[PDB]
């Protein structure tokens, strides 16, 4: 319960949750086309966020 279970649950898990989240968000091609379309997606969603909450 000390060491592994109380270190894998609270202290270590929070370590992993983030580590993994940075790995996906920061693995970027660096190509402009990809990045830009993401700008496209954003414009679309924000257009909607206004639209539906008109």
């Amino acid at each position: 319960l000390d060491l592994i279970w109380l270190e894998k649950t609270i202290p270590k898990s929070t370590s992993t949750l983030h580590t993994n989240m940075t790995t996906l968000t920061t693995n970027q091609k660096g190509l402009i086309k990809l990045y830009f379309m993401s700008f496209l997606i954003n414009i679309i969603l924000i257009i909607i966020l206004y639209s539906i909450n008109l």
């Binding site: 060491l3 592994i4 279970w5 894998k8 270590k12």
Partner: protein, 125 residues
């Protein structure tokens, strides 16, 4: 017949393997002294040394502490018999006593509310 238990183990005598003289056994039994003799002539050749101030290290003890407090989580793999047993130990009693203390505290409160608990000469808390 003496019956060794995990405690009260089988004595040296009364132990069959002691009565084993197969070539191999007398080859290990003489090989193991060597390891010990070797290690023995590596302590005394470092403890009986004049001109020494540094700390004889006993690395066999350093391999023990590292194995016991800093080589544990690098060798943890969550299986069953480990997480079931790793939850019964942390939450089991912690939930047991809650229904031990809630039931008592609730019994007490009811009785106080209904007017039965004497609380006599109790002027402190």
């Amino acid at each position: 017949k003496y019956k060794p238990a995990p405690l009260a183990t089988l004595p040296s005598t009364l132990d069959p393997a002691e009565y084993d003289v197969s070539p191999e056994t007398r080859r290990a039994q003489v090989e193991r002294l060597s390891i010990r003799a070797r290690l023995k002539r590596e302590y005394l050749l470092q403890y009986n040394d004049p001109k020494r101030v540094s700390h004889i290290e006993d690395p066999a003890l350093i391999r023990w502490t590292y194995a016991r407090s800093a080589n544990i989580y690098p060798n943890f793999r969550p299986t069953p018999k480990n997480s079931l047993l790793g939850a019964v130990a942390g939450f089991g009693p912690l939930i047991f006593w809650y229904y031990v203390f809630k039931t008592d505290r609730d019994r007490k409160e009811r009785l106080i509310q209904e007017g039965k608990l004497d609380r006599k000469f109790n002027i402190s808390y």
